[model samples]
Every structure is written in C-alpha cells, then in structure tokens.
Target: VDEPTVTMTFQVNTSPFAGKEGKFVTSRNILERLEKELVHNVALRVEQTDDPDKFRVSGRGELHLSILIENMRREGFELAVSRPEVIIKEEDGQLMEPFETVTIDVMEEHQGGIMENIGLRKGELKDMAPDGKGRVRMDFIMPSRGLIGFQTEFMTLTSGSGLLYHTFDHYGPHKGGNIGQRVNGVLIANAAGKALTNALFNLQERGRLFIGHGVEVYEGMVIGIHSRDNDLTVNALKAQVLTPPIVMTLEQALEFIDDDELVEVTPESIRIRKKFLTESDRKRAS
Candidate 1:
C-alpha cells in the first residue's frame, strides 16, 4: 500500500463536556469503529493494541484521521478524542520522534507569514521553488506535534487559495516544545438552557459570539473562545424582558456576539456556549 504505517490511539477528550455532541457515545462504539475501518478499508490496518485504554490504529496522516472523524460525524456518530499527540518510542536507548515533510503552495504575498509561523514550530526550510504564475512551492521538515492545528491557520493565512500537504518522514530526535493551540482561552457556559439574544448582546462586548438564539447549553460547556488569556464563565441563558416593544431582527440579534466568544460545533447544530458555565463549578473543577 502507498499509505505509511503509523499507530493512532482512540482516547477520551476529557474536556468538561465532551460527549454532548454525536452518536457513538461509548469507548466500545469507538473501538468497533476502528475495526470497521481497518476491515472495510484496505488502505488502513490496526497494527497492535496498545492497551485496554488505547488502541494503535495506524493511518496515512493527520488529515486522514480528521476526515474519518468528519465522515463519522456526518453519519451521526459523536465520540470524544483527545488532541492529537505523537506516539513516541525509545530506539537504541535514545529518544525517537516522528518527523514529517510539509509541502506548501501559496501566493507570493503570503510566503513570509507562512515561513515565520513554520519557523516558530521548529520547521527547517528545505527548498523554495517556482510553482508558475506568481506562486511558490515551499518545503519543510517538521515534527509531528508541530503540525498540529497548523492547517487551520495555514488556510486562514492563504485566504483559502494555498495548497498544503505533508508526508511522514523518519523518526529522529525529540523536539522539545509545544506546537499549536496558540489561542488564549475559551468561554464556558454558566447554566443549562437555550441562549437568549439579549444576554448575548451584553456578553458580545467580552468576545466574539459563538452561538445564536435558542442554542442548547450546559454548565461548563465551551460555547465560545475568549480573546484573552484567562477562562471566563458567563451566563448566556438570561432572557430579555420586553418593555419598549422593540423590533427584533436576526441582524440585531447577531450584534450580541463579541470577540470574546466562539461557537462550539455539534452533530445537530452549532451552538455558542461559555468555557466555564458556572463560576462555582469551574472553581471546584480547577
């Protein structure tokens, strides 16, 4: 097969509220899912069982696993997965780390930002070639963890015009540092109920809005991303009382969300919740 042999594990996300979204609710369901993929899809294979807690399911790359999750979600399967981490090993009494070669195609204007970002992730620039018609092809050697969450930012920088791909390189020395999730904090929901526009309007000042009207929320649920460093628990369930008989439109309702919020995704629909739903609950959890 053309696919590379690498092991992946299925573990719980363990975020305060993880399984609140899709169909596959248990570990058994997730395990069965891996079995179905390996058995049905010849391109992949389950090399070994790491333990009862985790299974070593090998695949092509990060996008491969992401696409699998996307497909399962479309099929009404919701399961929790921890942030992708590399499967490390000890080779000849020395630390061995998985490395990758990244290929990026972008316009001339966006090359500087991409190079700077990749450099921060410890990527070593290999080559820069012409891609014809004012475009460039760049290559880099980056650690597995360094590539995490990079596609999202890469797309944003490229304005959706850039083409990016990566293949597994050999295992080398451990690169000591974190790579992604550069965002500061998330907004947590303080209570369980449908979100009200009036309350969101007030909260919009804090951060960007994640949820619109009538989205279901629970305590400690991540409804939005905060712009700053610390997590904030907000009350998004408050209702607005009508006194002046104001005309309420969707655009007006949209004005309620601010930069301090982020919308959480689910199988059913997108909802805006807070990172900390209840003040006391967040305190106790911490």
Candidate 2:
C-alpha cells in the first residue's frame, strides 16, 4: 500500500549450471511470470532494462520482494536476484529513508543480545513491556536497511523462541553508520563435480559448509563460510561423515552475500555464486 522502499534487480539465470536445473530458463519465461504478477500486485513495479534479460523490481520491503522471487522459484522459474537496497530521496536538499516500527517478543534472558543488535543497526527503543506470557515485548524504530539479514541471528539467539514483527513506520532523514555486512569470508569452490566427503572433511574444521557431501558444486561457487574474513579457494570436490552441512536458507542469503556475489534460484535450489564463474574471471573482473 505504501511506496516501494526496497528494490532489487532480477535477471535470467546465465550460470554454467543453470539450464539443467530449471524448466523455465529464458528471459521470455521470466518476463511473462513477472508481468503476470503485476496484473494484481500494485505494490510492485517491474521496470525493464536495456539488457533484454534484466528487470529492476521494487516492492514494499525485503519480505515483500523476496517472497515473489521464492514464489517464482517454486513455480519453475530460474532467475538471479541482486541484493536488496532501500530507496532514498533528496527533499529540499535533505536526504530521506524509511524506518520500521519493530516489536520483539522474547524471554528476558534473550532480550539483551537482540537489543544490542538492534542498537548497532540504528534501532532506537521506543517502548518495552512484558508480554504477560512469560516474555517481554520491546518496541523499536529502526532504519529499514538495519533489518536486512537479521532473521537468522534473531532466530539463533532466541533458539526459535523469540518472535518479532516490523512495519514501515515513516520516512525520516537518512541515517549514517556501519549498518551491516558479513564478517566471515566464504569458502569458494575451485573444482566442479560432486562434493566429496573426504575433501569436505578436510575443510570442515575450517568453517561452516553450505552443501553436504554428494552435493554438486561448480567453480567459484560458495560451498561454505570461512572461519576468518578472507575468501579462500579450495577444491571441495574431494568432501562429510560427521556434522551435517549447514544449509544456507534463502533468508540467510540476505546477510550472506557480497556485492560481487549473486543468489541463484532454480526449481529446486538456491545457491550463492560469484558473478564470474572462475578464479581468473573473478580476478580479471577486478
């Protein structure tokens, strides 16, 4: 109902591994579905680009936009979506951005970390009260950008007991600061093939794995998150007997990718990949 405060670009999937996974893989197929949505969704705007394969779609927020992408994926559409960004405007030489009113319901013990996180994201506590159900409710007014990729951490901290909701509060002057970004680097695949349990075993101690043994991966695909902040190239083909690979859910994709990375959505998979499919290509792009 409100103006689109969040937007992302959508493009036909052109990865080396694209066509094999999706039945609908062409620009024509993608556009037809996008246009189909516009027939009833007045809240979204899908603008065409000079590149026949690309479209810029904007919506109320990340949830509003991402749900559409997810919906299409389930319907056999293969596409690539860019990271989410909020729209900003200059009014009377003053910049403006949208913020949301967030309400969190959590046990007293778990509220501390959430509050600290909300604080860093430029969230100002507006109100706090006990929910009267063995939990407390905390209110926040936070920049829309602050909420990006926040779901994973919130769910982890509260161990699934925490509940929260946020809605567009209003437009305010743009806030400045380090709102968010991933701290750990990713483990990139250098070899393409089925992931090997042995190879994965070697790298398992290094960090978290996104795909398990026997899962297919290609060059430049992100197979896991590194323990540190530097991206490392590894041949994950030689790959797990122990811990299950930590699956990267779509929601985690929000905080998980960098500007140079993309989310690959197919009929059955949601993967993280470098725009360039190889190390040399990645280097040459730079």
Candidate 3:
C-alpha cells in the first residue's frame, strides 16, 4: 500500500434523470459504501467535498479509479464522475506534475500514428525497438494528465492491435500546454420527452447518435455527437426521417464527453447530458 498518486472529484448523480435505477442515491449511502471500500483499498483515499453529495476520491491511477466505478455500478450504485485530473504541487514555488513512463507495443504499420499522437500529448520518446514478432515497442515519458481519455484514441490509432502499459515514474516540471480536447460537438435535446424514431432518423445525419428511438430524454441530454465543432440542440421528439444510430459502451461514452458534459450512470441505463440542463440556460451562461 502506498499514497495515492492521483486524485479526482466524484460528484453524485444530479442529472434531471437521477434516482431511477440505483437503490443507493442518497449522500449517506454513497459515503457509507465508499468508506467501506477504504477499509480494504489501502491506496485509495476518500474525502468530503463542500457539496454534501460530492466527494473527492484519490487513487493510484485512472484504471484504479475506473475499476472502482465499474464495481459500484455492478452493485447498483449510480453516479457521475469528472474527468481524472492530475494532482499538482508547488514545491519551492516551482510547479510540479506527476509523470508516467508509458510503454506501447503495436504493429509496425501503426508506429507513426502512435508516435504522432503521443507527441501531441507532450510525451517524450525514450526508446523504441522491435518486439521481434511483427510488433514494435515504444517507450514514452508523459504527464499523467496527458494520458486522460487517451486509451480510446490509442485503440483507434492502433486498429485494436496495440498493447499499452504505464507506471508512475516521478514528479517532474509542469508541462503547460493544450494537450487536446474532443474534436466533435454534441447533439443536445431541445425538449424533454420520449425520443421519436423519425426525429432520430433526421438527427442522425447531423452527427452520430447515442440514444436510440423511443428512449426517454431530457432537455440538454446529449443524444449524439455532432459532426461539427459546436453544440447543437435539436428536438429529439420530432417526427422526421433519419438513419440508424451507433451504439456506444460506457467506456466509449465516458471518453466521448467534453468538460461541460456529465455521464449519467444508472443500474439500468447510462446517459450523457450537458452540465446545463436547459438550452436557454446554456445560451445565457455562454
């Protein structure tokens, strides 16, 4: 057991569509469950947030935290989580950030794209060598924050033929730069109602759909990812012609959301919605 290298805030499920699936929805139940987890998970730490329903949980890595979440959901716990952010320190007035040494093995054909993507994350190439069986091994030292939401992208780059592993190396000088953000915008529901098949068909052309026909949706619920770079609100309940929607897993849904979105986790369903639950509110805030 060791001290947590990364910490992140976990907020209670507060979407317009909460408390419908999980038996544990109250703050007390959530805290009690997490406290029980702390008894055995020595490297895990949970602390209270100013908001009674929210708690800050720290752990060794993203995989560690994600495993906890997956377990909670399987046990009928519902909640929303923020993007995993790296814990930083100011040592003698010099900012420091956690760094990890990542080793990736992939087909030789994928080496170039993988290298480019790692470079985009501010990763420094430490070494590269052939794995001897039509695969290449590449080593990189990168900021922990850079690895957030990277697994899905890496999988795509390697065409599902890549193996990646990483371990904390040390604290290093803060790397200050835009790592990157989600490139696509989201399709927000303009009205709260059951989604119509025709409406989904017409909407599918604008972007990739997340929810299928007949699914219940609320205003500001993200129904799809837009092909463009700006958020668009559409009436998911409208009757029109459209195409079939793509299905996404919980992990993919988590990776798809941007900073202003939340993934709604429930025992029965997983949904993504805007932080602002109303179109007018979103516009006003913007």
Best by TM-score: 2
Report lDDT (Cα) of residue 187, candidate 3. Answer: 91
Tens-place lDDT per residue, model 1, 1-286, is 4444344444433334566666565657667777788766764655435555445555665556656655666776654333344667788898877789899999999999999989888799999998678999998999876776677679889999999989787788888775644455656787778988887776666666566667667776665556796777788888543222122122111222223222333365433333345677557766
- Sort order, lDDT high to low: 2, 3, 1
Q: What TM-score, to 2 decimals, does candidate 3 have? A: 0.92
Tell me the tens digit of each residue's lDDT in model 2 across 1-286: 6478988889988877988888888988888898999899877888999999999999888888888988988888899888888889788999999899998999999988999988888889989998677789989999998898777778988999989899987889988877768889889999889988888888988999888878889998888899999888899876127478777667678557888888989888889988888888888898
lDDT of 3 at 259: 70
Candidate 2: lDDT of 15? 77
Q: Which residue pairs in candidate 3 collide?
A: 201-242, 201-243, 202-241, 202-242
> Best candidate per lDDT, number?
2
Q: Between prediction 2 and prediction 3, which has the larger lDDT?
A: 2
lDDT of 3 at 158: 86
Each model's lDDT comes to 0.63, 0.86, 0.83
**In model 2, what is the error at residue 4, expressed in angstroms?**
0.6
- For every model shown, what is its TM-score relative to the native structure? 0.74, 0.94, 0.92
